[PDB]
Write a protein that binds this ligand. Sequence first.
Ligand SMILES: Nc1ncnc2c1ncn2[C@@H]1O[C@H](COP(=O)(O)OP(=O)(O)O)[C@@H](O)[C@H]1O
Ligand SMILES: Nc1ncnc2c1ncn2[C@@H]1O[C@H](COP(=O)(O)OP(=O)(O)O)[C@@H](O)[C@H]1O
Ligand SMILES: [Mg+2]
Ligand SMILES: [Mg+2]
Lengths: 322, 388, 96
Amino acid sequence: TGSAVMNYISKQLKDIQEFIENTKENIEIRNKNISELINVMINLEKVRVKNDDDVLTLDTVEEMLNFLKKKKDSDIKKCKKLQEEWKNLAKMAQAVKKDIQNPVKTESDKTKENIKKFEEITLKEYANSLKKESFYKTGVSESFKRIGEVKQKVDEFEVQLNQYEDFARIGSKKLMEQIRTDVSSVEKLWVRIEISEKTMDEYKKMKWGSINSMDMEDEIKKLRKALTDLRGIDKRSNAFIGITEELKKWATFLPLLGELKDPSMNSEDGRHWKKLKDLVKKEFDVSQELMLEIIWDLKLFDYKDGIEEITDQAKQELKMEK
Amino acid sequence: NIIVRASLMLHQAVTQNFRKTAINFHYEFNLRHMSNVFQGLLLSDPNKFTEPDKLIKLWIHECERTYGDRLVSTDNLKTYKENIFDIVKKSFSKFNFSRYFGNNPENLIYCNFIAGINSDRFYDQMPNNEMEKHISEALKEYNDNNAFMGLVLFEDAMKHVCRICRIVLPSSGHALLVGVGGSGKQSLSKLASFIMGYTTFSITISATYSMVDLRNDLQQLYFKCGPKEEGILFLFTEGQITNERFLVYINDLLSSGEIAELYTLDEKEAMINQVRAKVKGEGKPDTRENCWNWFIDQVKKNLHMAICFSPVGDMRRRARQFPALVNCTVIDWFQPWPYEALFNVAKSFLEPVDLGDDKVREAVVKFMPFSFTLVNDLGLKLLEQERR
Amino acid sequence: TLATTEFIKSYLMVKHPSLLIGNSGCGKTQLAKGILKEIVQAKPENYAYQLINFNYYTDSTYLQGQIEQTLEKKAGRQYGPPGKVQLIYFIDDLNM
Ligand SMILES: Nc1ncnc2c1ncn2[C@@H]1O[C@H](COP(=O)(O)OP(=O)(O)O)[C@@H](O)[C@H]1O
Ligand SMILES: Nc1ncnc2c1ncn2[C@@H]1O[C@H](COP(=O)(O)OP(=O)(O)O)[C@@H](O)[C@H]1O
Ligand SMILES: [Mg+2]
Ligand SMILES: [Mg+2]
């Protein structure tokens, strides 16, 4: 497996001679080319990468030669001739590399225009994010699709900028990181609001007392703290501030609802419960078991202090009655 | 064998250096204190200790947590630390332990948790860096499922958490926490419980609370840690004791897993029937009162006690009246809050307040501890003079 | 231990009580508890054991409870131990 290694080396020398002939035809085509000058510069860079690999292959050929001579005197004369053919190809490549260097300078200037377009692509994605978080309505699941489509359009802009940077061979990279961190934070806010909306919907279908006030408060209180834990877009916007006020309304609603579910009113019988409904001055229903949805649309926040007085009276009345 | 020579030499030093008195009753170092040091080396799982030098560092930690750190003063702790270092020097050579016994040393701690609450629990050295991170993280999981704890975390408090989490790791092991007023121990124990995975239990104090109501709760508490086999921490304060005879039932639970006049004849037999299913699962084919002697061993494994006594009043008397409360349990005295603790506390509470400027802000957080420490000094200067 | 253990055993086979003094160290309870298991392991029919710790609030009436808890009428001779076999009692913290 040393004489077999010398035979495989001789076959690799024949392959490099044909690869050199192909590299020469590729050099003439780039010479004929110089849009079109930028594509020629890209093919010139790949040929310059192939040329350094060929310069290393020519040295390896000359070593595989000297190995044969000491092992096959004739095989040493063959790969020494291969190194001689590699030097003649390296001379014609340096002439093409000079003309390529003139076009590469013109390409490097156009690279700065590609970097400026990337900066304009990054600023637009920053503004569109401000318009996505607002879009107010129940298209929160749908806005995730509009966000993801934006993330794909940014990711396409990143791959285009990563391709432009390879052609030229910091700030464009930092902007990409900042958008990705904004997208991740936006998505976390959409997931949390959707969970909180689901919990509000689940509570909304409870019995008159199945909620039990304190049990509702604990989940919201945990949810409200765990909302502030997330630090995406530094809150503000519109859609975010609105739901924190909706949660806060929901949070302030339960202690009042707890008084309406307290045993002093649960007793019913007397007209003391009907007097509570007369402050609201609205259409009301009395159900031992029914949806808390109606309670939230009954406007218990309105006539708050009036209700709070009737709750305290009703309690004092029960305690003596008992 | 060197550890066993080392642990003996340590016992001979401390028993000479610290003599028992009517005050500092606990200073008496019985055998069973020595026994708790070697209980900590068993908690050490194999494969997690490749290095020989390291197994000594674990024993050193364990000595301090066991029958160290039960000293009224910081001056006694300084003499105790010196006594070990010189015994550690003579016994162990070719192994350096400088910078773990020097003035201003590096804190060393060994808990079941290192990689965090979430990951697997192997008993090994925790780095001081991850300590601040992991106790903080562990609070957030408590601030989810439990009522908001509202504690400020300072180096000494994190030490106290880990220290309790050791004391409640072994089966028979029970905790006794001695703190002046607002020391920490009552809520620190509720945190410790949750890190270990044990759900905290505390008796509800009432005006109409009888012996039969306590005895009823103790049965339900046994039932949670017995057949159901869930780990249940038991938190007990001076406020929770209305009658002296309640503290009787407690002292029996610390002494052994068996309590007198807890279970009736029927309930005992009814419990043995439930356990009979388990011992067949364990693969010990016994259908006799050996099954009951397995139950109390399983109960005393999954029922730990965290008792919360004030130093000044109603301790020396109760310690004399019940030996179990101080003997059976591993006590950890709480010293006053250090300057480094007070500064961290003051800054958290004053963080929302404006305090005018940014230099002022820095001086006002500096003042709080400086004002507390010199009032505490004047309090001892006053005490010396007028007996105030 | 081996010396002291051998005596307490030989004493309980002659129905002569013993008493274990210690400065809360050297495992008085566990040595005694260990001995009582070794005797019960040998002859589980003849000798049974029951460990009664003494609290600060243990009276005569309370003690009668623990004695009445493990007894019989035993067809005359008044109170007799169950199984017609010699029940060992144990007492811890007799000082208090
Ligand atoms: N508002 C509060 N002020 C002080 N400590 C509080 C407060 N809320 C909860 N705690 C908790 O109470 C624990 C111990 O307080 P306390 O029971 O008064 O002391 P001790 O346990 O020493 O008797 C502290 O660890 C702290 O976390
Ligand atoms: N060889 C041994 N046999 C039994 N217990 C032992 C032995 N060596 C050490 N011990 C320990 O001695 C400890 C001391 O208990 P003991 O002195 O009986 O307590 P008390 O005097 O308070 O009743 C026990 O907890 C036990 O683990
Ligand atoms: Mg307190
Ligand atoms: Mg004992």
